[PDB]
Amino acid sequence: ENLYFQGSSWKWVSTGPLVFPKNDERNIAGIKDPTAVLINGTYHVFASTAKSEGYNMVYFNFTDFAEANNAPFYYLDQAPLGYGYRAAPQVFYFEPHKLWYLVYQNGNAAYSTNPDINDPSKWTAPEVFYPNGMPKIIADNIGNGYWVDMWVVCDDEEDPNKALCHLFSSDDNGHLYRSQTTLAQFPRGMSEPEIVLQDTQNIYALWEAACIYRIKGAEGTQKYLLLVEAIGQEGHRYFRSWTSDRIDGQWIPLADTEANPWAGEANVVFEGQKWTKSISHGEVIRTLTDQTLTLDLSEPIQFLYQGVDPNAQTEYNALPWRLGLITQ
Template identity: 35%
Template sequence: MLARTNNKRSQRTPTKHNALRAILPLTFVAGALTLTACGSQTSSTHTAHSAQANAAQTDPLACGNNTAAPLSWTSAGPLISPKEGDFAVKDPTVVYYNNQYHIFATINDGNWKSMQITLDNLDAQATTNYQPFSPGNTGSSAVAPQVFYFTPQKTWYMFTQWPASYTTNQNIEDVNGWIPRVTLPEGSKGAYKGNSLDFWVICNDADCYMYYFKDDGKMYYMSTPVDNFPNFDPGTFKVADIEDSGPTNIVFEAGNIYKIKNSDYYLLQVEGWGETESRRLYRSWLSTSLDGPWIAHHTDESAPFAGPENTTFNGPAWSHQISHGEMIRDGYDEKMVLDPCNMQMLYQGVDLNGFNGNYGERPYHIGVLKQK
C-alpha cells in the first residue's frame, strides 16, 4: 500500500489549460465545473479560471434535465463475486455485443489469472459462474484487460499488462479463440519498463493512442497511425498534460478515455483517492484532443466523477471504494464512444473494515454504477 499523499492542488500556471478553456463550452466556478442543460442558451455571472470563459455553457456530459446538479450514482449489490478458492475478482472490461454483456476481468487465487463471463443483463446478483482462461492456452494471464473490436481489421483485441501485450480473437463468444499474447516492444526509451500497468487504447479516424500508468502521479501515452495498428511507436512516447495532476493520489492508475457522443470532447477518468488510500474514487478531465491538454472536470474528493461521496447503495453499502472500472460504451469498437444519456459503469468494490491481508488478498467484487 502506498503512503497517503497530500491532496493539495497544483500551484503551476495552467497556460495551455486556459487557452483550451477559451474554446471549450465549459463554465468553471471557483475551480469547479458547473453544468447546464444540453442546448441551454442561458448565461450567468461567475468567477472563472480564465477571463475568456465568461458565459455558462453546456457540459458535454449533461443530458436533458441534468442541469447544475453534480454527478451521482446508485449501485445494487455485487454483480460478480469471487468463487470458492479465489480471493478477488477485479479489473473489469466490458462490451455489449450480440445482445449480451461480455465481461473479462482479473481473478486472484494466489496467482493473477484471467476470467470471462457473458451476461444477458447487469441486474443479476453475485454470480460466481465465470470461466478462467489463458490466451492461446499458454498458461499466461491477461491481467487488467481492455477489450474492443478494431473495425479496420475486423478483429477483437485485448490489451493487457505484465508485460505490455495484446491478444486477438475473431469471435468474442469463443473464449478459447484468443491467440497467445504478443508483447509490445519497449523501444530505446524503455517505455514499458518498471511497473507500467492499466493500458488503454482509443482511436480517432487517423491515429490510435495507448495510455498507461506507473503509479507515480502521471499518465503516459504513445500513438500510431490507424493503418499501422497495433505497432505503437515508442518514439512517440509522451507524458500527458493533465491539469492539477502531480500528487500520486490524483492521477494514480486505471484510467479510461472515451469520445463523448454527439460532441467534440473526450472524457478522461482516472482512479485515485482522497484523504485515505482505502477510499478509492474516480476523477475526470476533458479535452478536445487525444493529445490533451486535459482540463479539470470533476476532480474534488467531495464531488468526484464517481466515488463513495456520490454513490448510494440499493441495500447495504458493500463497498467503500469505486475502483478500477469501465463505462458501458455506446458500441464496442476502437472509438470508445460514451453516451452521456445512458451512463453505467462496472467497477471493483471492497469493504476493507477488519481486513489485514495483502493487496492481492483484498476481497474485491465487481459491481455496477448507474447514473441517477
C-alpha cells in the same frame, strides 16, 4: 441531447456486489478490473482474478445483472492467451481488422485478438506493443512503481493512413503516459511515450486505471473524457475526470476532487446493500464497441467497478474485491 454529461454534478446509484470469485480449486481472492460490452442484450465481461499467487483473467457473459454471479467463468489460461501473469484488460472491436482486441498488461503493454467475442477459447497468446521492452521514459520515471493499466483509444479521422491510435499507461508513480501510431499501422508502430499528465507531489492523485472516452456528438471542448483513479482519505478509491477537445491535447479538470469526484463515495448512493467505500478500476459498459471508445450520453452510463469491504485486512493481492455496478 447529452443529458447524461453531468458536468461537475455526476450522481450514481450502486448495486450491491454482483460478481464473486467461484468456490473452486483456483481459490481466487478477488475479481477485479472489469471491461465490458453489451451486444444484443448480452453483457460480455473480462476481468482479472487475483490471489497472493498471481493474476490471470476470466471471460463471462450474462443477460441480467442479478444473475451475473451465476455466470460460468471461462478461465482464459485455457486459451492460447495462457498461463502466466496477465491483468487489467480493456476490450474493443477493431473494425478495420474484424477482430476483437483485448489490451492488458503482462509485464509490458500486451494484446490478444479474437474474431468472435463469444468464443473465449480462441484468444491469442500475448503480443506486445513495445517490441524492445519498457520504454526509456517509463524506466527513467517509474521509481518504485509498476508499469500498469493499458488503454487504447483511436480518433475517428477519415483518413486511416493519418488517424491516430493512442495507448495510455500509468506507472504507480504519478505519471500518465501516451504513445501513438496510425490506424493503418495499428497495432504496430507505437511511438516512444510522452508524459501527458503528472502529479509528482502526490502520486496518489494520478494513480492508475485511466479511461479515455469519446463523447458521441460532442465536437468542441468536451469531445473527450479522461478518468483516472485516485486514492484519497483512508485509502478510499475514487475517479477524477478531465475533458479535452482531442485525445492528445490539453486536459482541463471536470469533476476532480474527492468531495466532488466523477465517481466516488461522495456521489454514489448505495440504495441497497452498502459494501464498499472505494469505487475502483472500473469501465463504462459500451454498446458502441469499436476502437473509438465512444459513449452515447443520451443514455445513462453504467460503470462496472471493483469494490471491497473497507474492513478487510489482508495482503494486497488477497483483498476480497468484488464487481459491482453504478448507474446514472
